[PDB]
Amino acid sequence: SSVYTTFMKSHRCYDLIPTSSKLVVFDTSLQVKKAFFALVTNGVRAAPLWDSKKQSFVGMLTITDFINILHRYYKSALVQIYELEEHKIETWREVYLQDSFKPLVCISPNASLFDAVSSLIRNKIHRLPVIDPESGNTLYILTHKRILKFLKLFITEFPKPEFMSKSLEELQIGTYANIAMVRTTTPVYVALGIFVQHRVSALPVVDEKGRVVDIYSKFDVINLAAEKTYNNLDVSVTKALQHRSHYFEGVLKCYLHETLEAIINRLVEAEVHRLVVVDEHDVVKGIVSLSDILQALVLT
Amino acid sequence: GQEMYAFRSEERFKSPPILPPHLLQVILNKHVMLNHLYALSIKDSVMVLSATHRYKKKYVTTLLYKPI
Amino acid sequence: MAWHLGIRSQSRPNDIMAEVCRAIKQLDYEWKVVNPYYLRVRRKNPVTSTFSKMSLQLYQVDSRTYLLDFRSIDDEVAPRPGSHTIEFFEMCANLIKNSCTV
Ligand SMILES: CCN(CC)c1ccc2cc(C(=O)N[C@H]3[C@@H](O)[C@H](n4cnc5c(N)ncnc54)O[C@@H]3COP(=O)(O)OP(=O)(O)O)c(=O)oc2c1
Ligand SMILES: CCN(CC)c1ccc2cc(C(=O)N[C@H]3[C@@H](O)[C@H](n4cnc5c(N)ncnc54)O[C@@H]3COP(=O)(O)OP(=O)(O)O)c(=O)oc2c1
Ligand SMILES: Nc1ncnc2c1ncn2[C@@H]1O[C@H](COP(=O)(O)O)[C@@H](O)[C@H]1O
């Protein structure tokens, strides 16, 4: 128990929703190719899935879905199987588990922010629909990014716990072993395979000396839905990153010996999902993600 | 007694009411329009329906993508 | 993105009304005629057993063109079936599909 735990347990999910927001919903009989293009066109990262037959929300369509489908699409094409691209949402969902069956994870606007964080961690998820039980409507999609920002802003800097002044290395927040990375020349299809195997939301791009020069993330993946690519998956990650060659400073990094406070501050101010942990010479040592931060704040 | 007569206004509803200038036909994306249905032009057999609804103090604009 | 309020038609106002009224009947919705261009519509959901309410209003936007407006009506962990907003969209869709053609 701390000033963070107290705050989270005494605030409702309702308090986090902006005055005005946009929500994209897909009927499950919609074509997959059309759904992912709708994500891009609407500037949105996820969409609740509506099953008309059941008159119910049954899941979410995210970039992780897109990664998995593209990976399967690429391998099937080399073996002359072409289905997915004319798959509807229900058929794609039927493919991947199907009893193995995963129900929709959601939360009430009146439930605590504590329960929201707990649900994200437990379910290994980044998108938590806030659903009003009276009307059944989805109001908002809650995220790590939004939650951390809220915490940073509405908690007074003081009554400050001792652990805020402690370094990442002291507190062991982040991942510092078996880091999923790609090289400058690594083809996109290989990168997708790495995404699927490690269930990770970003890949650092490194040179021959293991120094980070860029980052390949979920933002870069849905761009393949914008451009009518689907074909040129054999190109390098670098070529795929040309869509943002201009207007790009560099990768946001941190060091092992920075305080939790400084890193929370950097993550919030930058509006980014992770920092690449690096040494004196920009060699990748690990990743600290919003996932690690919120897991640390909820348990300590 | 004498037969009685009927006076009917008739033309009060001969034409539908004109759209009041506060309700606008087109929104670019790119008040109280609350609860009103909006739509994109149908493209490639898909319809996009849209509306804005209030929950307490919050407004959400929902878009439904739905095949014909 | 250009968003359009309801749907537009150049068909006769009385023919628009008669046709939405027939479509309502064919769909098993309840309705009330508030005035000749204003209808309240009520539906029992086949799956959920809950009720959905909306309004239909016809407007004239120019000398040959009319506008049909649809407005949802406000009443009074795994999710249960149902969503007022989505069901509103589905009512509208079903009504359009069964009353008119492009
Ligand atoms: C070996 C067979 N196979 C390969 C063909 C499989 C098998 C299983 C899956 C499952 C997926 C999934 O679940 N993705 C997604 C998504 O569909 C689902 N999900 C997200 N939010 C959810 C919620 N609130 N409730 C329920 N589910 C939610 O969880 C997965 C993780 O997404 P995420 O929350 O990390 O979002 P993000 O992608 O980071 O925006 C998926 O993309 O691909 C799969 C492929
Ligand atoms: C009008 C000018 N223009 C047209 C060309 C735009 C318009 C919009 C964007 C949006 C971007 C973005 O949303 N990136 C993404 C991403 O490229 C970047 N980012 C994430 N982690 C980073 C890190 N560790 N270091 C550096 N960057 C990181 O920050 C943005 C937010 O991503 P995210 O943290 O929500 O999750 P994701 O990285 O997508 O899994 C972006 O990069 O470039 C843009 C250019
Ligand atoms: N490239 C990566 N390699 C290894 N682990 C990662 C990587 N990116 C994120 N993680 C870890 O995986 C968990 C979820 O990460 P994220 O997908 O960023 O929420 C967190 O513990 C991260 O530190």
UniProtKB/Swiss-Prot annotation, chain A:
<feature type="binding site">
    <location>
        <begin position="201"/>
        <end position="202"/>
    </location>
    <ligand>
        <name>AMP 3</name>
    </ligand>
</feature>
<feature type="short sequence motif" description="AMPK pseudosubstrate">
    <location>
        <begin position="113"/>
        <end position="134"/>
    </location>
</feature>
<keyword id="KW-0597">Phosphoprotein</keyword>
<feature type="binding site">
    <location>
        <position position="180"/>
    </location>
    <ligand>
        <name>AMP 3</name>
    </ligand>
</feature>
<feature type="binding site">
    <location>
        <position position="127"/>
    </location>
    <ligand>
        <name>ATP 2</name>
    </ligand>
</feature>
<dbReference type="GO" id="GO:0019901">
    <property type="term" value="F:protein kinase binding"/>
</dbReference>
<dbReference type="GO" id="GO:0043609">
    <property type="term" value="P:regulation of carbon utilization"/>
</dbReference>
<comment type="subunit">
    <text>AMPK is a heterotrimer of an alpha catalytic subunit (PRKAA1 or PRKAA2), a beta (PRKAB1 or PRKAB2) and a gamma non-catalytic subunits (PRKAG1, PRKAG2 or PRKAG3). Interacts with FNIP1 and FNIP2.</text>
</comment>
<feature type="domain" description="CBS 4">
    <location>
        <begin position="247"/>
        <end position="300"/>
    </location>
</feature>
<keyword id="KW-0276">Fatty acid metabolism</keyword>
<comment type="function">
    <text>AMP/ATP-binding subunit of AMP-activated protein kinase (AMPK), an energy sensor protein kinase that plays a key role in regulating cellular energy metabolism. In response to reduction of intracellular ATP levels, AMPK activates energy-producing pathways and inhibits energy-consuming processes: inhibits protein, carbohydrate and lipid biosynthesis, as well as cell growth and proliferation. AMPK acts via direct phosphorylation of metabolic enzymes, and by longer-term effects via phosphorylation of transcription regulators.</text>
</comment>
<feature type="binding site">
    <location>
        <begin position="273"/>
        <end position="274"/>
    </location>
    <ligand>
        <name>AMP 2</name>
    </ligand>
</feature>
<feature type="binding site">
    <location>
        <position position="252"/>
    </location>
    <ligand>
        <name>ATP 2</name>
    </ligand>
</feature>
<dbReference type="GO" id="GO:0051170">
    <property type="term" value="P:import into nucleus"/>
</dbReference>
<feature type="binding site">
    <location>
        <position position="175"/>
    </location>
    <ligand>
        <name>AMP 3</name>
    </ligand>
</feature>
UniProtKB/Swiss-Prot annotation, chain B:
<comment type="subunit">
    <text>AMPK is a heterotrimer of an alpha catalytic subunit (PRKAA1 or PRKAA2), a beta (PRKAB1 or PRKAB2) and a gamma non-catalytic subunits (PRKAG1, PRKAG2 or PRKAG3).</text>
</comment>
<protein>
    <recommendedName>
        <fullName>5'-AMP-activated protein kinase subunit beta-2</fullName>
    </recommendedName>
</protein>
<comment type="similarity">
    <text>Belongs to the 5'-AMP-activated protein kinase beta subunit family.</text>
</comment>
<comment type="function">
    <text>Non-catalytic subunit of AMP-activated protein kinase (AMPK), an energy sensor protein kinase that plays a key role in regulating cellular energy metabolism. In response to reduction of intracellular ATP levels, AMPK activates energy-producing pathways and inhibits energy-consuming processes: inhibits protein, carbohydrate and lipid biosynthesis, as well as cell growth and proliferation. AMPK acts via direct phosphorylation of metabolic enzymes, and by longer-term effects via phosphorylation of transcription regulators.</text>
</comment>
UniProtKB/Swiss-Prot annotation, chain C:
<comment type="function">
    <text>Catalytic subunit of AMP-activated protein kinase (AMPK), an energy sensor protein kinase that plays a key role in regulating cellular energy metabolism. In response to reduction of intracellular ATP levels, AMPK activates energy-producing pathways and inhibits energy-consuming processes: inhibits protein, carbohydrate and lipid biosynthesis, as well as cell growth and proliferation. AMPK acts via direct phosphorylation of metabolic enzymes, and by longer-term effects via phosphorylation of transcription regulators.</text>
</comment>
<feature type="modified residue" description="Phosphoserine">
    <location>
        <position position="63"/>
    </location>
</feature>
<comment type="similarity">
    <text>Belongs to the protein kinase superfamily. CAMK Ser/Thr protein kinase family. SNF1 subfamily.</text>
</comment>
<comment type="subunit">
    <text>AMPK is a heterotrimer of an alpha catalytic subunit (PRKAA1 or PRKAA2), a beta (PRKAB1 or PRKAB2) and a gamma non-catalytic subunits (PRKAG1, PRKAG2 or PRKAG3). Interacts with FNIP1 and FNIP2.</text>
</comment>
<protein>
    <recommendedName>
        <fullName>5'-AMP-activated protein kinase catalytic subunit alpha-1</fullName>
    </recommendedName>
</protein>
